[PDB]
From a paper:
In termination of translation, the complete protein is released from the ribosome by a class-1 release factor (RF) recognizing one of the universal stop codons (UAA, UAG, and UGA), signaling the end of the amino acid encoding open reading frame (ORF) of the mRNA. RF1 and RF2 read UAA, UAG, and UAA, UGA, respectively, while the omnipotent eRF1 reads all three stop codons. Each stop codon in the decoding center (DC) is recognized by a stop-codon recognition (SCR) motif in a class-1 RF, and all RFs have a peptidyl transfer center (PTC)-binding GGQ motif, named after its universal Gly–Gly–Gln triplet (GGQ), for coordinated ester bond hydrolysis in the P-site bound peptidyl-tRNA. Further cryo-EM work showed that ribosome-bound RF1 and RF2 have extended structures, facilitating coordinated codon recognition in DC and ester bond hydrolysis in PTC.
We assembled a UAA-programmed release complex, RC0, with tripeptidyl-tRNA in the P site, and visualized its structure with cryo-EM. The RC0 displays no intersubunit rotation, and the tripeptide of its P-site tRNA is seen near the end of the peptide exit tunnel. The mRNA of the DC is disordered, but the overall resolution of the RC0 is high (2.9 Å). Apart from a small fraction of isolated ribosomal 50S subunits, the RC0 ensemble is homogeneous. In the RF-lacking termination complex, A1492 of helix 44 in 16S rRNA stacks with A1913 of H69. A1493 is flipped out and stabilizes the first two bases in the A-site stop codon. G530 stacks with the third base A in the stop codon.
Author numbering:
A (entry chain B): 2 to 272
B (entry chain d): 1 to 46
C (entry chain T): 1 to 94
Amino acid sequence: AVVKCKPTSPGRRHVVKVVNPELHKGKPFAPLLEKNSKSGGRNNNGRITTRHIGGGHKQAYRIVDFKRNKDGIPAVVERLEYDPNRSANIALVLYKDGERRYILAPKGLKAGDQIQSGVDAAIKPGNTLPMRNIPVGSTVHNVEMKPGKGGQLARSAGTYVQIVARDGAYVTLRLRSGEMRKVEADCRATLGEVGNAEHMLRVLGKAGAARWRGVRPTVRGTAMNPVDHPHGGGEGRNFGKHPVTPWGVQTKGKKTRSNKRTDKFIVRRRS
Amino acid sequence: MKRTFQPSVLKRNRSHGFRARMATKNGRQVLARRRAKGRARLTVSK
Amino acid sequence: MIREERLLKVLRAPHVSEKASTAMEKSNTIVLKVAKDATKAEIKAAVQKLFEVEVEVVNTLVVKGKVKRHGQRIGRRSDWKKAYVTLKEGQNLD
RNA sequence: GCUCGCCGGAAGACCAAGGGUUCCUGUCCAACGUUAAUCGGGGCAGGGUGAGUCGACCCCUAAGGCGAGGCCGAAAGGCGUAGUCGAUGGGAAACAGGUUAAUAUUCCUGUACUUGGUGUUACUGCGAAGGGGGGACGGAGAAGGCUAUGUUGGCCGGGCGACGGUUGUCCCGGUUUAAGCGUGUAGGCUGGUUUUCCAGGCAAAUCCGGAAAAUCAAGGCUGAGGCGUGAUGACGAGGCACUACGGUGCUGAAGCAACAAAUGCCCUGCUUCCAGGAAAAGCCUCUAAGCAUCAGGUAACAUCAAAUCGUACCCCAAACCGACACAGGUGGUCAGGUAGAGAAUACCAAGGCGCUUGAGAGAACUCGGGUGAAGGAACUAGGCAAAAUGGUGCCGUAACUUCGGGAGAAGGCACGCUGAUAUGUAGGUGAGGUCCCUCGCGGAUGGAGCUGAAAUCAGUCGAAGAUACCAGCUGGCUGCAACUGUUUAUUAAAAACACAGCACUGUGCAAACACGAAAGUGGACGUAUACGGUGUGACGCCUGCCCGGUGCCGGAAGGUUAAU
RNA sequence: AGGACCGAACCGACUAAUGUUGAAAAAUUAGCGGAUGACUUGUGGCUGGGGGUGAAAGGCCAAUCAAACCGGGAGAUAGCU
Ligand SMILES: [Mg+2]
Ligand SMILES: [Mg+2]
Ligand SMILES: [Mg+2]
Ligand SMILES: [Mg+2]
Ligand SMILES: [Mg+2]
Ligand SMILES: [Mg+2]
Ligand SMILES: [Mg+2]
Ligand SMILES: [Mg+2]
Ligand SMILES: [Mg+2]
Ligand SMILES: [Mg+2]
Ligand SMILES: [Mg+2]
Ligand SMILES: [Mg+2]
Ligand SMILES: [Mg+2]
Ligand SMILES: [Mg+2]
Ligand SMILES: [Mg+2]
Ligand SMILES: [Mg+2]
Ligand SMILES: [Mg+2]
Ligand SMILES: [Mg+2]
Ligand SMILES: [Mg+2]
Ligand SMILES: [Mg+2]
Ligand SMILES: [Mg+2]
Ligand SMILES: [Mg+2]
Ligand SMILES: [Mg+2]
Ligand SMILES: [Mg+2]
Ligand SMILES: [Mg+2]
Ligand SMILES: [Mg+2]
Ligand SMILES: [Mg+2]
Ligand SMILES: [Mg+2]
Ligand SMILES: [Mg+2]
Ligand SMILES: [Mg+2]
Ligand SMILES: [Mg+2]
Ligand SMILES: [Mg+2]
Ligand SMILES: [Mg+2]
Ligand SMILES: [Mg+2]
Ligand SMILES: [Mg+2]
Ligand SMILES: [Mg+2]
Ligand SMILES: [Mg+2]
Ligand SMILES: [Mg+2]
Ligand SMILES: [Mg+2]
Ligand SMILES: [Mg+2]
Ligand SMILES: [Mg+2]
Ligand SMILES: [Mg+2]
Ligand SMILES: [Mg+2]
Ligand SMILES: [Mg+2]
Ligand SMILES: [Mg+2]
Ligand SMILES: [Mg+2]
Ligand SMILES: [Mg+2]
Ligand SMILES: [Mg+2]
Ligand SMILES: [Mg+2]
Ligand SMILES: [Mg+2]
Ligand SMILES: [Mg+2]
Ligand SMILES: [Mg+2]
Ligand SMILES: [Mg+2]
Ligand SMILES: [Mg+2]
Ligand SMILES: [Mg+2]
Ligand SMILES: [Mg+2]
Ligand SMILES: [Mg+2]
Ligand SMILES: [Mg+2]
Ligand SMILES: [Mg+2]
Ligand SMILES: [Mg+2]
Ligand SMILES: [Mg+2]
Ligand SMILES: [Mg+2]
Ligand SMILES: [Mg+2]
Ligand SMILES: [Mg+2]
Ligand SMILES: [Mg+2]
Ligand SMILES: [Mg+2]
Ligand SMILES: [Mg+2]
């Protein structure tokens, strides 16, 4: 439920919260946590590789089952939890033999439902089965690219991938970007759209709310000196040049994909 | 005002001390230069 | 058992002082200048054998040497170690 | 020595960092000290730092560093696994009193505590590099219970007043006491217990996790403070004595209650929010190989051990960083009275100072202030600077608006003291007494005593009652930027940058991109509701025409065209 | 509840005066802004010079920055003084 905030102060004027009352109001499950130390966008050389990353609230990492290998054993869903590590909410599930794991929460999943992986699983939102067992034309998420590698496609808060075709060893997918990609028919996928679909309806409202998420401010390139950026300089506002990166690569329109290994897997590009 | 030398013995020895010089190759060449010049205090280290 | 040869090298000198004269008559504690690497057990073993007297406890402290100037040349005296050796009651020592 | 003045959320006290003998005593006055100096942080000599509990070391890890092999690289070397380092965080335990010229939670007196050794005695499943638990964690807010501490009364000791009065509802001073041990309270959390079973916890497991069934609602965990003990002690105003006038010795009364009360404690709580809040060991537990009456295990008692290093002194400063005995800078802890919302501010206590040139004179001029006739911005680039406003309560408050604001708009009234209501009210606190009780740190009832606003009425004083310090000038029009924020350390704080938003574009994951000869790493333990780049810059209404040029994207028939 | 309000600590530096061989190689005095947050601070770490870092002033990188410092080529070169 989106909640428009009342304008008691500027900085609360434009805030829309996304309030989900079903999330667990307690501590997360302690065995599945581990330390997630921040980086600041800096590699092992100490240099800033990717800009604008730094600060933000401390975040513990939640070990999430993407591989989803407990086949045959049914699992009931204990509660839904908030995950700071990702945009989608996660679900704490309890198998029959007593193991607890975290999965990505699908759209219609709530506390108390039963999920089950494996080939003999039913087709309800939550089950995970190889895509030679999933009917053509259904919406799945948490899709593997390689069998047993773990789900890599359609993991962000409201995404999903449709299965449009199958020719023997491959299935053809309609990715969320609109790209048509071939994936082997033995890769696991999880039924239904992924949960937190109204995540994109939030508006942060103030500058500090982006600093809470560890997003340092972005200085636009024309506000610099020519030693700093190709856009920099000028006596006033001058931009008489084609828009490039800080490293002189065209940005408005120039393609950058240079992977000739995976070109056989791409049916059509995005539009 | 706050001036540029704010001393700390721990930071003085980790940065300029004896074992910090002997750790790397160029730091060992620093101690070879000071021995060739004949320094009384070969490093920072007390 | 501390070896008998080391126990002869532990003790250096008695320390004469106003505080040493006070501790001998009130707390019954002698003040000794000891070797610098000597520990408390080595002092207690040395005083109980070389002076033939019963030691209750030994407290030690290291005296840092002063910086003096002979003429105009700077210099530093040696660090030495000081022991407050409390004898048991009834025991007496010169 | 007596006065005077100054600080007193510090200009007092305790440390860390840093310094390194500046500490204490004797002695010296050349140099050093912005003067003299008998003095000194100066010279010279001597003295001074005492730990099983404080701290370090040590056990443990964070960021990070190093890194066997390894991978990579002309060489140097780079990265990194197992590991091993690395506190600023986790990990056993001591308090009170006394004492030195100088140290004390270290010495002494008193009373404790912890962890290891060995050794007997009783007891017998022990065992890890493994499993589990615990350690173990955010911001904000709300009270409640307390204590530190203060005030008043009582109590004890002293006093009866240089000048009117002062045997009293008078004045002065004291009224202190710990860790530990016992009690388990306010209060917080929690359903217990037994059996059966179990694709989980890499194997195992009695443990944890999960299924059952049965039974009991009441056990457990945490917990400030209080009370008791510690304590017939210690401390204690004063006296009594000697006096090197510094002191030293001796003796010692009362040692209670009420009320107020923290930013400290319960509280690592509770409530709530989204931005979703270290790790590892100690500690607890489970078994694996192993061990089989041995080892080990816990239990009592006895005994032994607890090393080494630091401990002086300054530490918002004359001792540290500033070349100086430099209006600078410097993290933590302690937080008395009166007024006050207050850690503001005024004056004070404890405590510490008067800032290492003075003495006169009382010109111009400069510096920092005070007041000013009449006028009141005529000054000026410009009300720069000054002056003015200033508190609380109540009344009242416009355009406009995103309905929150504007707004403390503006403007005005009241304000002291005394008495009465009421010898102190409403309220707070809550004793005896009585009742009840699973009996206690219990529950009612009960109101003594203490504390105590605020208001009305009456009176009264001054020129003036928010009387000092303290403490908004206000309104009208308009440019720009939405805002809070940011910036040229040291002439520019702005309309510049950032910003939420918006859009374009790239990017299918071994992602684009970036740092790297490379290995790799960041992006990201993320996956197109994601990430990078670029422009614009909340919000409202909107964003028109041009693809010739320059880019970019798509095309592949022809022309042209490299090595070969 | 709040990048909410008033206001000390604390952080900052808008205006004026002083000072300009200063008390001070940027400070004092009287005002001033922020003051639960994009806050501030201790300790330790990491990024290195055509490199870092930069809410972007060509700012900052040890009183030095349109390419730091130190040593070396080195007695660079100087139709100039
Ligand atoms: Mg960015
Ligand atoms: Mg942006
Ligand atoms: Mg920007
Ligand atoms: Mg610019
Ligand atoms: Mg350029
Ligand atoms: Mg122009
Ligand atoms: Mg033009
Ligand atoms: Mg002792
Ligand atoms: Mg010692
Ligand atoms: Mg000296
Ligand atoms: Mg002295
Ligand atoms: Mg002297
Ligand atoms: Mg003289
Ligand atoms: Mg002189
Ligand atoms: Mg001296
Ligand atoms: Mg300790
Ligand atoms: Mg490491
Ligand atoms: Mg090697
Ligand atoms: Mg390495
Ligand atoms: Mg270690
Ligand atoms: Mg520490
Ligand atoms: Mg520690
Ligand atoms: Mg002292
Ligand atoms: Mg463990
Ligand atoms: Mg908190
Ligand atoms: Mg009390
Ligand atoms: Mg009189
Ligand atoms: Mg009289
Ligand atoms: Mg009295
Ligand atoms: Mg007690
Ligand atoms: Mg001391
Ligand atoms: Mg002081
Ligand atoms: Mg000073
Ligand atoms: Mg002076
Ligand atoms: Mg006060
Ligand atoms: Mg004050
Ligand atoms: Mg002076
Ligand atoms: Mg005059
Ligand atoms: Mg005036
Ligand atoms: Mg006038
Ligand atoms: Mg007059
Ligand atoms: Mg007049
Ligand atoms: Mg005029
Ligand atoms: Mg004029
Ligand atoms: Mg003015
Ligand atoms: Mg004024
Ligand atoms: Mg105009
Ligand atoms: Mg602005
Ligand atoms: Mg502002
Ligand atoms: Mg400036
Ligand atoms: Mg300025
Ligand atoms: Mg990678
Ligand atoms: Mg712009
Ligand atoms: Mg246009
Ligand atoms: Mg065109
Ligand atoms: Mg065209
Ligand atoms: Mg083309
Ligand atoms: Mg605010
Ligand atoms: Mg600044
Ligand atoms: Mg000021
Ligand atoms: Mg304020
Ligand atoms: Mg410029
Ligand atoms: Mg500089
Ligand atoms: Mg350079
Ligand atoms: Mg150059
Ligand atoms: Mg040459
Ligand atoms: Mg030359």
